[PDB]
Every structure is written in structure tokens, then in C-alpha cells.
Design a binder for this molecule. Structure first.
Ligand SMILES: CN1CCN(c2cc(-c3ccncc3)c(Cl)nn2)CC1
Ligand SMILES: Fc1ccc(-c2n[nH]cc2-c2ccncc2)cc1
Ligand code: NA
Length: 336
């Protein structure tokens, strides 16, 4: 049942992966973990192998490890990164302390291609359509990405895009900047608008230096909140700030994004609305005339129900670790 593992040291960390994965070369490391590119001999595809860093060192870490595994196992969509394999070199639960995730290898992210080439309107259409297509799938399972940004959008040479990890502040919705605890899925739509504006102009839309400067840059373009939006702010300390600034009017998006496709400008206006209740959804954005060449209602599927009840649970270290263990053995690979 269990395959054969081989041990090797890459960078300053260790890797114990099955024999089917060969030629492990590092791609990029961080606080999340170490990612290696490998060749899968069972399928012939190039894969990305991610070793989690300290998966069960604290309650926050153990729950986070369980959350990522449950999330990656549920995502089955062409525009969302999915799990090709999940393994551990441990034979029992007692020695279980390392988790490895395997997925399709993507050569670059949207950050590596935005400044390398100012994208044409046709390429922006295809890239943003793929984001919204994957966002409709994610949002249909009551999941919010919360951290959409160019580095979180993997693209290959074929212009095919996938969402990952479902300055960062440059793409954050203003309701999160104001610490509103009841934001909805439309915070991701705000990030898409910031990303789509960057691809069209080649510039970061809101390159704020801090949480304060970020809001001033946003309010400079979309204007200060009106009376309808002000009625929805319960935090008196929040209103003590917004109602105290110099009131900014909403700028003409056709003038700010001059020379761009008028259909692209119209979509940005519906995406970059201050009031989150009036922001366009992912499903509505797919039907926008900007994506007429790509929109297909019968090929924009939704996700199966996702059980998020674990998020409101207070468990111990071994309990989160044992639940993560169960998800490893119960994994079923996707069909070839
Ligand atoms: C902001 N993010 C940048 C990329 N992140 C990534 C990228 C990958 C990946 C997937 C497929 N092909 C290559 C690499 C993985 Cl597996 N994990 N995190 C790490 C954090
Ligand atoms: F300046 C702003 C910027 C954003 C908002 C906002 N948009 N949608 C929801 C909110 C919001 C922000 C803070 N508290 C409640 C609601 C309100 C005022
Ligand atoms: Na992965």
C-alpha cells in the first residue's frame, strides 16, 4: 500500500517524498512552506511539491494546516489550484509531523507577467475572465479568498490561469481597511478590479504606504462615502475618521482610464464601488459585455457544498493533527 520514500536536503530543509517524484528543484520558499518542482513518473506531468513549515507547532498552525488540506481537497475547477496528491512519510499517527502537497506546476504568476509586458485588451479579457470564473466557483461554496493579488494568480505559457492560496494592502477592499467584521464575498471583486486596472495601465491602482494612506488613495478615485453608505457604519470611531476628512468626489473613470476599452471602464466602475452591497458579483461580471468572446453560461460551474463547521471549533493539538491525518489517508487522486 505504502510507496518507497527517498530522503534529501534542499536549501536548509529536508524532503522525504515517494520515489515517483524525481528531480526536486526549489521554486520559492516563505512563511507558508517550501515549494519544489518535480517530475511525476506516474503521470509524466511536472508537479509542484509543497512541504508545510511547522504544521503542528501551535493551535493556530494545526488548525491552519487542517484548513488548507480540507480546502485544497475540495477545489476541483480549471481556474482554481487543486490537489494532485497529499502524502506523509509517517507510517502512523504518532510519528505524523510532516505534510506534503502536490499540484500541477505553474511556470509564473500574474506579477511576473504584468510588468514584463503591458497586456493588450484581448489578454486582459481572457485573464480576468478566468479569475472571475474561478471566483464564481469559490464563492458558490461560501468561501472568500480575502487575499487576491497578482502573486496569488498562477499562469502558464498557455495564458491559462489558476487561483492560489484561497504589498497585500494594495488590493484589499476598503471595508477590510476599516476593520468591518461583516464583509461579504464582494471583497474579492474589489481585488479583481484593482488587478484588472493594473493590467490595463501597467501601474498599481492604490499603492498606499499604510492603512491610512491606502484609504486616502481609494477615496481619491471613488469619492468619500455618501449618506447611504454612512448609514451602514456602526463603528463610531470609523465615522469619526471618514466624516472628518475633506470630502472627495467620485472621479470620472472614463477620464482616469482614458484610451481603454469603454466596456473595460464600465466593468471597473461596477467592481470598484465603495458600498459592498452594490458591488457586482462574480457571476454577474461573467455576463458583462466585456467577456462576450469567452462567456459561456453552461461552462461556468459551481462547487459542491463545503463543510466549514470546523472553523468554529476549539480543539487540541492532537485533535487537529488527527483530523489532518484522516484527510491524508482518505484522499482520492483525480482521474488521469
Ligand atoms: C503568494 N503566494 C505565491 C505562490 N505561493 C505558492 C505557489 C505554489 C505553486 C503552485 C504551483 N506551481 C508553482 C507554485 C504553491 Cl504549491 N504554494 N504556494 C506561495 C505564496
Ligand atoms: F470609507 C468607507 C469605505 C468603505 C466602506 C464600506 N463599504 N462597504 C462596507 C463598508 C463598511 C466599512 C466599515 N464599517 C462598516 C461598513 C465604508 C466607508
Ligand atoms: Na499544492
Amino acid at each position: 500500500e505504502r510507496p518507497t520514500f527517498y530522503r534529501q536536503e534542499l536549501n536548509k530543509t529536508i524532503w522525504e517524498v515517494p520515489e515517483r517524484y524525481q528531480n526536486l528543484s526549489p521554486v520559492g520558499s516563505g512563511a507558508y512552506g517550501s515549494v519544489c518542482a518535480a517530475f511525476d513518473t506516474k503521470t509524466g506531468l511536472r508537479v509542484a511539491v509543497k512541504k508545510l513549515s511547522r504544521p503542528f507547532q501551535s493551535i493556530i498552525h494545526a488548525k491552519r494546516t487542517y484548513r488548507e488540506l480540507r480546502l485544497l481537497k475540495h477545489m476541483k475547477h480549471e481556474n482554481v489550484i487543486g490537489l494532485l496528491d497529499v502524502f506523509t512519510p509517517a507510517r502512523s499517527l504518532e510519528e505524523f509531523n510532516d505534510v506534503y502537497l502536490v499540484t500541477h506546476l505553474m511556470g509564473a504568476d500574474l506579477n511576473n507577467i504584468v510588468k514584463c509586458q503591458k497586456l493588450t485588451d484581448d489578454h486582459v479579457q481572457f485573464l480576468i475572465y478566468q479569475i472571475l470564473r474561478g471566483l464564481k466557483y469559490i464563492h458558490s461554496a461560501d468561501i472568500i479568498h480575502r487575499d487576491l493579488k497578482p502573486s496569488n494568480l498562477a499562469v502558464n505559457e498557455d495564458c491559462e490561469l489558476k487561483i492560489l492560496d484561497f504589498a497585500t494592502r494594495w488590493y484589499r477592499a476598503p471595508e477590510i481597511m476599516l476593520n468591518w467584521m461583516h464583509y461579504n464575498q464582494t471583497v474579492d471583486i474589489w481585488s479583481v478590479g484593482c488587478i484588472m486596472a493594473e493590467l490595463l495601465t501597467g501601474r498599481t491602482l492604490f499603492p498606499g504606504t499604510d492603512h491610512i494612506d491606502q484609504l486616502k488613495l481609494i477615496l481619491r478615485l471613488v469619492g468619500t462615502p455618501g449618506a447611504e453608505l454612512l448609514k451602514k457604519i456602526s463603528s463610531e470611531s470609523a465615522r469619526n475618521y471618514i466624516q472628518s476628512l475633506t470630502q472627495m468626489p467620485k472621479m470620472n473613470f472614463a477620464n482616469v482610464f482614458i484610451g481603454a476599452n469603454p466596456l473595460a471602464v464600465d466593468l471597473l466602475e461596477k467592481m470598484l464601488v465603495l458600498d459592498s452591497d452594490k458591488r457586482i458579483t462574480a457571476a454577474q461580471a461573467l455576463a458583462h459585455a466585456y467577456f462576450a468572446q469567452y462567456h459561456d453560461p453552461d461552462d461556468e460551474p459551481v462547487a459542491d457544498p463545503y463543510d466549514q463547521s470546523f472553523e468554529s471549533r476549539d480543539l487540541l493539538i492532537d485533535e487537529w493533527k488527527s483530523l489532518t491525518y484522516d484527510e491524508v489517508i482518505s484522499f482520492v487522486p483525480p482521474p488521469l
